[PDB]
Amino acid sequence: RPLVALLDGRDCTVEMPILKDVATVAFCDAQSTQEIHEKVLNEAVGALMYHTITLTREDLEKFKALRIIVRIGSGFDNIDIKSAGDLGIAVCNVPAASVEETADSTLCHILNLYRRATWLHQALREGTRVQSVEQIREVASGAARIRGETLGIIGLGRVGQAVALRAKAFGFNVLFYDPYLSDGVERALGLQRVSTLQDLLFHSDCVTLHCGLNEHNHHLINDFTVKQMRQGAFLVNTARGGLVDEKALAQALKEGRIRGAALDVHESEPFSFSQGPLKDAPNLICTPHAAWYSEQASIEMREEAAREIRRAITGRIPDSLKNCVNKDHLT
Amino acid sequence: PLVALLDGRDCTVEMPILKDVATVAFCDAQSTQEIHEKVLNEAVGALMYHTITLTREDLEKFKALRIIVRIGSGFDNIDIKSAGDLGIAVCNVPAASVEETADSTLCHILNLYRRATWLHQALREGTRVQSVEQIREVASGAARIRGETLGIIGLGRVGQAVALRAKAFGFNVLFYDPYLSDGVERALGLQRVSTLQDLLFHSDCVTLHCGLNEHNHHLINDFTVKQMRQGAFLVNTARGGLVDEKALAQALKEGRIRGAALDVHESEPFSFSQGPLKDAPNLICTPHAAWYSEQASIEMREEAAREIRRAITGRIPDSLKNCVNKDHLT
Amino acid sequence: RPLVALLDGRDCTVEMPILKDVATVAFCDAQSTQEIHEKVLNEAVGALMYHTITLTREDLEKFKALRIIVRIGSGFDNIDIKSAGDLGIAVCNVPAASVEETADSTLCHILNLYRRATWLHQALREGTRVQSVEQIREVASGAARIRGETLGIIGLGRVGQAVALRAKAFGFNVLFYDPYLSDGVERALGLQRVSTLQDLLFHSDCVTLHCGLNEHNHHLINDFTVKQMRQGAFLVNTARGGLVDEKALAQALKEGRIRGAALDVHESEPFSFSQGPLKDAPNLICTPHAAWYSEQASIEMREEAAREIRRAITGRIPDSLKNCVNKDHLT
Amino acid sequence: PLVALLDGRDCTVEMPILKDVATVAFCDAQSTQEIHEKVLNEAVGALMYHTITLTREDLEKFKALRIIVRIGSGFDNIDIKSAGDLGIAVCNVPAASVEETADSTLCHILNLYRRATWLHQALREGTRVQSVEQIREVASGAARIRGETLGIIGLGRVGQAVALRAKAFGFNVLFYDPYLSDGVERALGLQRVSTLQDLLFHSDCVTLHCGLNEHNHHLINDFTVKQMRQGAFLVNTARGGLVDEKALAQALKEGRIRGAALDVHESEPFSFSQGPLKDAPNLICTPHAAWYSEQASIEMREEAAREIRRAITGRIPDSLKNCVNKDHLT
Amino acid sequence: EALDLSMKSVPWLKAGALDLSV
Amino acid sequence: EALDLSMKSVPWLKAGALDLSV
Ligand SMILES: NC(=O)c1ccc[n+]([C@@H]2O[C@H](COP(=O)([O-])OP(=O)(O)OC[C@H]3O[C@@H](n4cnc5c(N)ncnc54)[C@H](O)[C@@H]3O)[C@@H](O)[C@H]2O)c1
Ligand SMILES: NC(=O)c1ccc[n+]([C@@H]2O[C@H](COP(=O)([O-])OP(=O)(O)OC[C@H]3O[C@@H](n4cnc5c(N)ncnc54)[C@H](O)[C@@H]3O)[C@@H](O)[C@H]2O)c1
Ligand SMILES: NC(=O)c1ccc[n+]([C@@H]2O[C@H](COP(=O)([O-])OP(=O)(O)OC[C@H]3O[C@@H](n4cnc5c(N)ncnc54)[C@H](O)[C@@H]3O)[C@@H](O)[C@H]2O)c1
Ligand SMILES: NC(=O)c1ccc[n+]([C@@H]2O[C@H](COP(=O)([O-])OP(=O)(O)OC[C@H]3O[C@@H](n4cnc5c(N)ncnc54)[C@H](O)[C@@H]3O)[C@@H](O)[C@H]2O)c1
């Protein structure tokens, strides 16, 4: 029976009962491409990987029997798609298993910036005591009224559409920018569309990123573009860490051009408050890249990935695959 | 005439309005025993926040008081019936922070399901998470919102605002209110129950939005807290006297309640090192600031000042717009 | 056993199984106060009536044993409430049994005026033939775009609130006028409120009536007020017939100041197109006062009214009554 | 160059745009045999509505045609593949009447439940109703909207607009679309089925919003019409070729279908005195005018005119924005 | 079994089936 | 029964119970 390896992981309690009568399961709990066992590089047919490991063209050439790679999640920017197609390797993913979980987490961060709640809870644990009304107005200074504000969205995908529907119930005014969509998509949802990125930044009070990390949008929020935003705006990022230049963001927070920022993904992971360009920056909220986790979502995505492997082994590639992302490049 | 601010020091907004019709003064008092003797003899009107309580004995010490205006929506700290007999009118600002309080309630609900305050707190303590297995452990307990049931106690101004916003996330909404008419749920497309016990049996998250009258003190007592489901949430942003904190602490420790978010407490100011909730897991607290906003603060202060001016240059209670003791007034 | 009479009706298949072991049921099928049998006027304890018969103080004095009147519906403007209280008679009704049925019918009339559908269907039955595109633009001339328009509502009650929620999904802008409500009701629903009737008419493109017929609003839309509306507005009436002066409305339709009007209730009933001030008026839609009927709604309201009678007979008045409207006037 | 309007007479909007770059002309033709000989030899571009059909034989008669622009969203009356081989580009206006068509669909749905067109028609015929019993008889058949299930075939631009508006009335929405990706229903919070038969089994009202390709001609045929529920509705506003009118007429007479509202028919123009639907109860028909609006008409005519100008003063198909036969073009 | 106290037994309402009882 | 091909058997992940097996 063939061999299937989990590149970065130790727990295989869900995949084992599915792939037990058709293949052999193994794990390697690796943190880099140099920690992969020699047996895997010679006798592996399929592989499963999370977002914690990156594969390049040189790494792919070291495999001698790999035929399919399945990514547990929705992002595949850490795999060289074009190079794998030339070598004859198919890449798959799970498109939508945590659409609603990520949309709810985005709304939670937006409300924390307007109605300051994490900062107020943090102050009480430090020992701050507030008794009079004047003290209340000072500790919670900066809260604003949501109704009448403008919300800007970059990338109207699965998550982007979910956020737009929930934001209208609070009184927001929604704009979006997407250059790869057809005409009339905004008519169905009753939204407003702009044509340039600069126009979106001029008329927005809160900016959220929901696009993908291709090769034409690296460091989208750079030093030049961060000066085109309004005076005292917010920024929420939950898509990818490579879309924001953290060095330029830190200077904006100190000078006061940006009132606050909530981040879930960073350029360098794992994140620590004592290291990096954001070592000492006021008005910052960070989470350890957990905007997708749920009890139901975790089980659903692991079972779907396991069944994709079984179809490939007992079928034909890529006719039997449902979610293939390098079909054009495959030869 | 003389107008006094019982508990406050800042009068930059009320002064330009009440400058050509009365004399403004402040006391900055924290108790009824810290009021100056001149106020007790030569005061026509008064302004007060929620930080001071007046009883019948306190009211009898005033010799010229005619009107009391409460800056806010709650008036449970003033003896309404006793003031009516003495010939004193009580007013308030009904709706100036309806939407601010509704947004704050939704923020607390999302923090319990999608754990965000606790995850941010862990990072500041120095916790480091690198592998996926570590992520599943630190954030263990998150759930899926769609398909859950939300229970609301008291469908008022704030209660209706919360219900509309909760339907966009996929919640199923029930409510309990014994003082409403028939068919209110038909207009909003909600579901209504008839008893408090029935609401607790079929709810996964309970929010309090009622008023603090004399028939609902310690509504969530020891007996009722055992009728809730296994592993439910609790959000309180109305008043501190509706929840028995001694019984709540035991439920959190044993695990019958997964978490609780509180904005108002029985004893204020609140401190994590004192009280029955000194050591209780899964707790979120805020310093009674679910109403503050830059626009809301200015709006409520101007409205209260103009209510005083109408009373002085008019007749009581014909010229008053928001009077709460009109029936008891003689 | 006591006697219970149905003043205007012939069918009693629903009330009979309930009030069979506590009273005696009878019907009169009367169309006026002069067609009531002498036995009823002397030996009747309770009565049931629809909206087709009107009772005055002189009519009430002819009863010698009446104690309770139950109105099957939500309106009670055809009964002298104050006079019945002095004589010692309680009046009840069914508050909410057709809230959603009436709200859906109101939205149907609004859409027919904008997207002309009844008029287009009527034209085809008359034999009109349209083949080219130019003919299509002419027969359906007058249709407009809903998004961006302003909707004005008079009276925000049970039905008024239901209409407002449904109208926001189509892109309407909603205003309302109600002088008997408290402060902050519009904050909860996110609407806009005006303070005078004249201000509402100046800034509205479509006016709907949802108020009650008390003694201070008879002929609310009179000759003087109809000239304060915009040039080319609509008008929908589904509450009561006494709120609109039909003589002044007919002149407005002919001159063109009002583009169209949909009516469900009229001053004189039954309605006929060949009689009345509206004999020849263009752009008119009329229905025979059936904005409440439904298979489920009809059964629900008849059972509730029957059970209200039984509680009064086997209880005390007005302690056992749930929906009493003349409790203050009762002595 | 010369630009011709195949089926039309009015050119008041296109003329001011295409006056300094081309010569405008119209034919007002009703068939391919009524086109002037000059057009067939000296025409560069053409504009056409839905009233004329072009086949491969018709296309071969043109000697200088290079681009065809369709004023509207449907292009099923033009042979797309054949035009690509000959070297002709086809364009259209994708979204100019999305909201107009969605509003018209909702109007037809409400007329079937809350009978309003039929009640208005009865009054004009002279029917008189006075008593309550008469009211229950003339309006017999009305139902309660809340709790019902709505089935949608094809979730496109119009399909998504209808789904959002239907949820405000209390409907339960399902849809069937085999050409969409995964997770589209998660964003909008809808429910998705995998087979057409499953949709018909659990639906109380069926609406068609798909396109007319070569794999779905007569989608509602005799065999499929027997799989629907007892006493269901049917609304069609997409195309006339998706429904077999001969089988629909028998269903209405026997009572298996309570009613039907149609805006497009197999044979046009439509007349109540001709066709298989000559005598069928509970029928509502409109003369194919679910798209017209004062603003929509002007918008679509200006956009089509500017598409021609770019092609003349540019390159094909690099300068075109909405091209539908780019793959087949050589 | 509802008692028919329809004193003014007029015929201004033709509301249902045709009565052909002998 | 998953095969443990954890060649670089390092200890950069302390993720669960304390192992007190003898
Ligand atoms: N826990 C997490 O942090 C988490 C979880 C899930 C997804 N994500 C990330 O969310 C992002 C969006 O996911 P999705 O499912 O909505 O994706 P999707 O592929 O369904 O949609 C992405 C959208 O981005 C648009 N886009 C691409 N490049 C753009 C650009 N330069 N400017 C503007 N728009 C652009 C595309 O046209 C498309 O509309 C992905 O990057 C994904 O990896 C993060
Ligand atoms: N920052 C804050 O914490 C803050 C700010 C504003 C208001 N509040 C509190 O919010 C509460 C609600 O305010 P509102 O404007 O919605 O009030 P409201 O007076 O408009 O409505 C209160 C509702 O409670 C209902 N109710 C009363 N007793 C009840 C009982 N025993 N059980 C169930 N329902 C009952 C009433 O019938 C009514 O529907 C008040 O207690 C107010 O003081 C708190
Ligand atoms: N089939 C039908 O035609 C049908 C069916 C049901 C109800 N109705 C009519 O609908 C109307 C409204 O019913 P509801 O249940 O919403 O009533 P409701 O009593 O619940 O509310 C009526 C509202 O009208 C307001 N109002 C009173 N006088 C006003 C005035 N002069 N200007 C503005 N607002 C004023 C009141 O303050 C209240 O808000 C009633 O007249 C009822 O008889 C008609
Ligand atoms: N006045 C009118 O009658 C009028 C006006 C405008 C559009 N239309 C018609 O409306 C229809 C839809 O327009 P749109 O803009 O939404 O189109 P669109 O191209 O944006 O979307 C059409 C959808 O149909 C789906 N589909 C295709 N074949 C299907 C099948 N066999 N079963 C199920 N789904 C299928 C597609 O995958 C797509 O999701 C078109 O036929 C159009 O011509 C009519």
JSON list of N, CA and C in Angstrom, two decimals, chain B residues 250-293:
[
{"chain": "B", "resi": 250, "resn": "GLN", "atom": "N", "xyz": [-20.15, 30.67, 42.07]},
{"chain": "B", "resi": 250, "resn": "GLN", "atom": "CA", "xyz": [-20.12, 29.22, 42.23]},
{"chain": "B", "resi": 250, "resn": "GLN", "atom": "C", "xyz": [-20.39, 28.51, 40.91]},
{"chain": "B", "resi": 251, "resn": "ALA", "atom": "N", "xyz": [-21.29, 29.06, 40.09]},
{"chain": "B", "resi": 251, "resn": "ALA", "atom": "CA", "xyz": [-21.61, 28.44, 38.81]},
{"chain": "B", "resi": 251, "resn": "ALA", "atom": "C", "xyz": [-20.41, 28.44, 37.88]},
{"chain": "B", "resi": 252, "resn": "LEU", "atom": "N", "xyz": [-19.65, 29.54, 37.86]},
{"chain": "B", "resi": 252, "resn": "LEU", "atom": "CA", "xyz": [-18.48, 29.61, 36.99]},
{"chain": "B", "resi": 252, "resn": "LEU", "atom": "C", "xyz": [-17.42, 28.59, 37.38]},
{"chain": "B", "resi": 253, "resn": "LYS", "atom": "N", "xyz": [-17.20, 28.40, 38.69]},
{"chain": "B", "resi": 253, "resn": "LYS", "atom": "CA", "xyz": [-16.17, 27.47, 39.14]},
{"chain": "B", "resi": 253, "resn": "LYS", "atom": "C", "xyz": [-16.54, 26.03, 38.80]},
{"chain": "B", "resi": 254, "resn": "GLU", "atom": "N", "xyz": [-17.79, 25.64, 39.04]},
{"chain": "B", "resi": 254, "resn": "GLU", "atom": "CA", "xyz": [-18.19, 24.26, 38.78]},
{"chain": "B", "resi": 254, "resn": "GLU", "atom": "C", "xyz": [-18.29, 23.95, 37.29]},
{"chain": "B", "resi": 255, "resn": "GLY", "atom": "N", "xyz": [-18.45, 24.97, 36.45]},
{"chain": "B", "resi": 255, "resn": "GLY", "atom": "CA", "xyz": [-18.51, 24.77, 35.02]},
{"chain": "B", "resi": 255, "resn": "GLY", "atom": "C", "xyz": [-19.89, 24.75, 34.42]},
{"chain": "B", "resi": 256, "resn": "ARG", "atom": "N", "xyz": [-20.94, 25.05, 35.20]},
{"chain": "B", "resi": 256, "resn": "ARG", "atom": "CA", "xyz": [-22.29, 25.08, 34.64]},
{"chain": "B", "resi": 256, "resn": "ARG", "atom": "C", "xyz": [-22.50, 26.26, 33.71]},
{"chain": "B", "resi": 257, "resn": "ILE", "atom": "N", "xyz": [-21.71, 27.32, 33.85]},
{"chain": "B", "resi": 257, "resn": "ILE", "atom": "CA", "xyz": [-21.78, 28.49, 32.98]},
{"chain": "B", "resi": 257, "resn": "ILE", "atom": "C", "xyz": [-20.42, 28.67, 32.33]},
{"chain": "B", "resi": 258, "resn": "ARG", "atom": "N", "xyz": [-20.40, 28.72, 30.99]},
{"chain": "B", "resi": 258, "resn": "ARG", "atom": "CA", "xyz": [-19.13, 28.76, 30.28]},
{"chain": "B", "resi": 258, "resn": "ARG", "atom": "C", "xyz": [-18.44, 30.11, 30.44]},
{"chain": "B", "resi": 259, "resn": "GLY", "atom": "N", "xyz": [-19.20, 31.20, 30.46]},
{"chain": "B", "resi": 259, "resn": "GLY", "atom": "CA", "xyz": [-18.61, 32.51, 30.60]},
{"chain": "B", "resi": 259, "resn": "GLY", "atom": "C", "xyz": [-19.66, 33.55, 30.92]},
{"chain": "B", "resi": 260, "resn": "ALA", "atom": "N", "xyz": [-19.19, 34.74, 31.26]},
{"chain": "B", "resi": 260, "resn": "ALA", "atom": "CA", "xyz": [-20.08, 35.84, 31.61]},
{"chain": "B", "resi": 260, "resn": "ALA", "atom": "C", "xyz": [-19.37, 37.17, 31.35]},
{"chain": "B", "resi": 261, "resn": "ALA", "atom": "N", "xyz": [-20.10, 38.11, 30.75]},
{"chain": "B", "resi": 261, "resn": "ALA", "atom": "CA", "xyz": [-19.61, 39.46, 30.50]},
{"chain": "B", "resi": 261, "resn": "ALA", "atom": "C", "xyz": [-20.50, 40.43, 31.26]},
{"chain": "B", "resi": 262, "resn": "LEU", "atom": "N", "xyz": [-19.89, 41.26, 32.10]},
{"chain": "B", "resi": 262, "resn": "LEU", "atom": "CA", "xyz": [-20.63, 42.17, 32.96]},
{"chain": "B", "resi": 262, "resn": "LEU", "atom": "C", "xyz": [-20.15, 43.60, 32.75]},
{"chain": "B", "resi": 263, "resn": "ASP", "atom": "N", "xyz": [-21.10, 44.53, 32.72]},
{"chain": "B", "resi": 263, "resn": "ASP", "atom": "CA", "xyz": [-20.80, 45.95, 32.63]},
{"chain": "B", "resi": 263, "resn": "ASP", "atom": "C", "xyz": [-21.24, 46.73, 33.86]},
{"chain": "B", "resi": 264, "resn": "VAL", "atom": "N", "xyz": [-22.16, 46.19, 34.66]},
{"chain": "B", "resi": 264, "resn": "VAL", "atom": "CA", "xyz": [-22.65, 46.83, 35.87]},
{"chain": "B", "resi": 264, "resn": "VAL", "atom": "C", "xyz": [-22.60, 45.82, 37.00]},
{"chain": "B", "resi": 265, "resn": "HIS", "atom": "N", "xyz": [-22.25, 46.29, 38.20]},
{"chain": "B", "resi": 265, "resn": "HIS", "atom": "CA", "xyz": [-22.07, 45.42, 39.35]},
{"chain": "B", "resi": 265, "resn": "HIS", "atom": "C", "xyz": [-22.83, 45.97, 40.54]},
{"chain": "B", "resi": 266, "resn": "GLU", "atom": "N", "xyz": [-23.05, 45.10, 41.54]},
{"chain": "B", "resi": 266, "resn": "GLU", "atom": "CA", "xyz": [-23.78, 45.51, 42.73]},
{"chain": "B", "resi": 266, "resn": "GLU", "atom": "C", "xyz": [-23.05, 46.61, 43.49]},
{"chain": "B", "resi": 267, "resn": "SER", "atom": "N", "xyz": [-21.74, 46.46, 43.66]},
{"chain": "B", "resi": 267, "resn": "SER", "atom": "CA", "xyz": [-20.92, 47.43, 44.37]},
{"chain": "B", "resi": 267, "resn": "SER", "atom": "C", "xyz": [-19.95, 48.08, 43.39]},
{"chain": "B", "resi": 268, "resn": "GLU", "atom": "N", "xyz": [-19.95, 49.40, 43.35]},
{"chain": "B", "resi": 268, "resn": "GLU", "atom": "CA", "xyz": [-19.08, 50.15, 42.45]},
{"chain": "B", "resi": 268, "resn": "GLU", "atom": "C", "xyz": [-18.29, 51.18, 43.24]},
{"chain": "B", "resi": 269, "resn": "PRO", "atom": "N", "xyz": [-17.05, 51.48, 42.83]},
{"chain": "B", "resi": 269, "resn": "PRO", "atom": "CA", "xyz": [-16.34, 50.95, 41.66]},
{"chain": "B", "resi": 269, "resn": "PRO", "atom": "C", "xyz": [-15.89, 49.50, 41.81]},
{"chain": "B", "resi": 270, "resn": "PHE", "atom": "N", "xyz": [-15.66, 48.83, 40.68]},
{"chain": "B", "resi": 270, "resn": "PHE", "atom": "CA", "xyz": [-15.32, 47.42, 40.67]},
{"chain": "B", "resi": 270, "resn": "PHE", "atom": "C", "xyz": [-13.82, 47.21, 40.68]},
{"chain": "B", "resi": 271, "resn": "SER", "atom": "N", "xyz": [-13.38, 46.18, 41.41]},
{"chain": "B", "resi": 271, "resn": "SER", "atom": "CA", "xyz": [-11.98, 45.81, 41.47]},
{"chain": "B", "resi": 271, "resn": "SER", "atom": "C", "xyz": [-11.86, 44.29, 41.42]},
{"chain": "B", "resi": 272, "resn": "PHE", "atom": "N", "xyz": [-10.88, 43.80, 40.66]},
{"chain": "B", "resi": 272, "resn": "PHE", "atom": "CA", "xyz": [-10.70, 42.36, 40.52]},
{"chain": "B", "resi": 272, "resn": "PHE", "atom": "C", "xyz": [-10.20, 41.69, 41.79]},
{"chain": "B", "resi": 273, "resn": "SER", "atom": "N", "xyz": [-9.63, 42.46, 42.72]},
{"chain": "B", "resi": 273, "resn": "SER", "atom": "CA", "xyz": [-9.05, 41.90, 43.93]},
{"chain": "B", "resi": 273, "resn": "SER", "atom": "C", "xyz": [-10.01, 41.87, 45.11]},
{"chain": "B", "resi": 274, "resn": "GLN", "atom": "N", "xyz": [-11.24, 42.35, 44.94]},
{"chain": "B", "resi": 274, "resn": "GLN", "atom": "CA", "xyz": [-12.21, 42.40, 46.03]},
{"chain": "B", "resi": 274, "resn": "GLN", "atom": "C", "xyz": [-13.56, 41.91, 45.53]},
{"chain": "B", "resi": 275, "resn": "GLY", "atom": "N", "xyz": [-14.37, 41.39, 46.46]},
{"chain": "B", "resi": 275, "resn": "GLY", "atom": "CA", "xyz": [-15.71, 40.97, 46.15]},
{"chain": "B", "resi": 275, "resn": "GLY", "atom": "C", "xyz": [-15.84, 39.47, 45.99]},
{"chain": "B", "resi": 276, "resn": "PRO", "atom": "N", "xyz": [-17.08, 38.99, 45.83]},
{"chain": "B", "resi": 276, "resn": "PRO", "atom": "CA", "xyz": [-17.29, 37.55, 45.63]},
{"chain": "B", "resi": 276, "resn": "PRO", "atom": "C", "xyz": [-16.67, 37.01, 44.36]},
{"chain": "B", "resi": 277, "resn": "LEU", "atom": "N", "xyz": [-16.39, 37.86, 43.37]},
{"chain": "B", "resi": 277, "resn": "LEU", "atom": "CA", "xyz": [-15.80, 37.44, 42.10]},
{"chain": "B", "resi": 277, "resn": "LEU", "atom": "C", "xyz": [-14.29, 37.64, 42.09]},
{"chain": "B", "resi": 278, "resn": "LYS", "atom": "N", "xyz": [-13.64, 37.48, 43.25]},
{"chain": "B", "resi": 278, "resn": "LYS", "atom": "CA", "xyz": [-12.20, 37.71, 43.33]},
{"chain": "B", "resi": 278, "resn": "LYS", "atom": "C", "xyz": [-11.42, 36.74, 42.44]},
{"chain": "B", "resi": 279, "resn": "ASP", "atom": "N", "xyz": [-11.81, 35.46, 42.45]},
{"chain": "B", "resi": 279, "resn": "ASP", "atom": "CA", "xyz": [-11.13, 34.43, 41.67]},
{"chain": "B", "resi": 279, "resn": "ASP", "atom": "C", "xyz": [-12.20, 33.58, 40.98]},
{"chain": "B", "resi": 280, "resn": "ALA", "atom": "N", "xyz": [-12.60, 34.01, 39.79]},
{"chain": "B", "resi": 280, "resn": "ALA", "atom": "CA", "xyz": [-13.58, 33.28, 39.00]},
{"chain": "B", "resi": 280, "resn": "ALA", "atom": "C", "xyz": [-13.14, 33.23, 37.54]},
{"chain": "B", "resi": 281, "resn": "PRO", "atom": "N", "xyz": [-13.03, 32.05, 36.95]},
{"chain": "B", "resi": 281, "resn": "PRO", "atom": "CA", "xyz": [-12.54, 31.96, 35.57]},
{"chain": "B", "resi": 281, "resn": "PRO", "atom": "C", "xyz": [-13.58, 32.44, 34.57]},
{"chain": "B", "resi": 282, "resn": "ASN", "atom": "N", "xyz": [-13.09, 32.82, 33.39]},
{"chain": "B", "resi": 282, "resn": "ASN", "atom": "CA", "xyz": [-13.92, 33.19, 32.25]},
{"chain": "B", "resi": 282, "resn": "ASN", "atom": "C", "xyz": [-14.84, 34.37, 32.59]},
{"chain": "B", "resi": 283, "resn": "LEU", "atom": "N", "xyz": [-14.22, 35.51, 32.87]},
{"chain": "B", "resi": 283, "resn": "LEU", "atom": "CA", "xyz": [-14.94, 36.71, 33.27]},
{"chain": "B", "resi": 283, "resn": "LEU", "atom": "C", "xyz": [-14.42, 37.91, 32.49]},
{"chain": "B", "resi": 284, "resn": "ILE", "atom": "N", "xyz": [-15.35, 38.73, 32.00]},
{"chain": "B", "resi": 284, "resn": "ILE", "atom": "CA", "xyz": [-15.03, 39.98, 31.31]},
{"chain": "B", "resi": 284, "resn": "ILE", "atom": "C", "xyz": [-15.81, 41.10, 31.99]},
{"chain": "B", "resi": 285, "resn": "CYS", "atom": "N", "xyz": [-15.11, 42.18, 32.35]},
{"chain": "B", "resi": 285, "resn": "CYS", "atom": "CA", "xyz": [-15.72, 43.29, 33.06]},
{"chain": "B", "resi": 285, "resn": "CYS", "atom": "C", "xyz": [-15.28, 44.61, 32.45]},
{"chain": "B", "resi": 286, "resn": "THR", "atom": "N", "xyz": [-16.20, 45.58, 32.47]},
{"chain": "B", "resi": 286, "resn": "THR", "atom": "CA", "xyz": [-15.96, 46.94, 32.00]},
{"chain": "B", "resi": 286, "resn": "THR", "atom": "C", "xyz": [-16.46, 47.93, 33.05]},
{"chain": "B", "resi": 287, "resn": "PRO", "atom": "N", "xyz": [-15.85, 49.13, 33.12]},
{"chain": "B", "resi": 287, "resn": "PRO", "atom": "CA", "xyz": [-16.16, 50.08, 34.19]},
{"chain": "B", "resi": 287, "resn": "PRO", "atom": "C", "xyz": [-17.38, 50.96, 33.94]},
{"chain": "B", "resi": 288, "resn": "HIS", "atom": "N", "xyz": [-18.51, 50.32, 33.61]},
{"chain": "B", "resi": 288, "resn": "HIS", "atom": "CA", "xyz": [-19.80, 51.01, 33.46]},
{"chain": "B", "resi": 288, "resn": "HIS", "atom": "C", "xyz": [-19.70, 52.16, 32.46]},
{"chain": "B", "resi": 289, "resn": "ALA", "atom": "N", "xyz": [-19.28, 51.81, 31.24]},
{"chain": "B", "resi": 289, "resn": "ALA", "atom": "CA", "xyz": [-19.07, 52.79, 30.18]},
{"chain": "B", "resi": 289, "resn": "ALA", "atom": "C", "xyz": [-19.66, 52.31, 28.87]},
{"chain": "B", "resi": 290, "resn": "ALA", "atom": "N", "xyz": [-20.85, 51.71, 28.92]},
{"chain": "B", "resi": 290, "resn": "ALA", "atom": "CA", "xyz": [-21.53, 51.22, 27.73]},
{"chain": "B", "resi": 290, "resn": "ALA", "atom": "C", "xyz": [-22.37, 52.29, 27.05]},
{"chain": "B", "resi": 291, "resn": "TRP", "atom": "N", "xyz": [-22.35, 53.52, 27.57]},
{"chain": "B", "resi": 291, "resn": "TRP", "atom": "CA", "xyz": [-23.15, 54.61, 27.04]},
{"chain": "B", "resi": 291, "resn": "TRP", "atom": "C", "xyz": [-22.33, 55.74, 26.44]},
{"chain": "B", "resi": 292, "resn": "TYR", "atom": "N", "xyz": [-21.03, 55.80, 26.72]},
{"chain": "B", "resi": 292, "resn": "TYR", "atom": "CA", "xyz": [-20.25, 56.98, 26.37]},
{"chain": "B", "resi": 292, "resn": "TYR", "atom": "C", "xyz": [-20.01, 57.07, 24.87]},
{"chain": "B", "resi": 293, "resn": "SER", "atom": "N", "xyz": [-20.10, 58.29, 24.35]},
{"chain": "B", "resi": 293, "resn": "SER", "atom": "CA", "xyz": [-19.73, 58.61, 22.98]},
{"chain": "B", "resi": 293, "resn": "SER", "atom": "C", "xyz": [-19.51, 60.11, 22.91]}
]
